[PDB]
Design a protein around this ligand. Structure first.
Ligand code: A1BPI
Ligand code: ZN
Length: 140
């Protein structure tokens, strides 16, 4: 579990979004596994605006923050799960690291701020949904 709180926005994995999130929906994309909902309170996270390929992510299944190298956002084949059939997920970045389904929502960050959240994994590889292209998160 986990979310990014930037301004009056809440960014979560689409497959973990709540009823309040769907009721207060701003934008969602099934192919990115992302959902953004509105909030009444202001958040304190900063979204990175960069091309960094190194950062640190939180892994709740180990209670640890791991430094990683990750690939640039791309269209990747993702195996079926209880949340989606087998499909291609867009804007996804991979790293060599540990992850379990419950780790989704863990933040990946670089020196410029939040890069994305854990979204896929298995076989010693962890995938993160990129948020750095969503410029509107910094305004209105
Ligand atoms: C973070 N992580 C996801 C894992 C999965 C796959 C899985 O449960 N999901 C849920 C939806 C997500 C998606 N975006 O398609 C994939 C299997 C094994 C280890 C995993 N570590
Ligand atoms: Zn950066």
């Amino acid at each position: 579990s986990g979310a990014i709180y930037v301004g009056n926005y809440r960014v979560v994995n689409r497959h973990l979004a709540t009823h309040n999130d769907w009721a207060n929906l701003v934008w969602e994309d099934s192919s990115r596994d992302l959902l953004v909902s509105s909030t009444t309170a202001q958040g304190c996270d900063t979204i990175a605006r960069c091309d960094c390929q190194t950062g640190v992510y939180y892994c709740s299944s180990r209670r640890k923050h791991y430094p990683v190298s990750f690939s640039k956002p791309s269209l990747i084949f993702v195996e079926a799960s209880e949340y989606y059939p087998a499909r291609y997920q867009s804007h996804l970045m991979l790293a060599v690291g540990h992850s379990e389904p419950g780790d989704c929502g863990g933040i990946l960050r670089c020196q410029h701020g939040v890069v994305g959240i854990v979204s896929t994994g298995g076989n010693g590889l962890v995938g993160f949904a990129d948020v750095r292209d969503l410029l509107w998160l910094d305004e209105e």
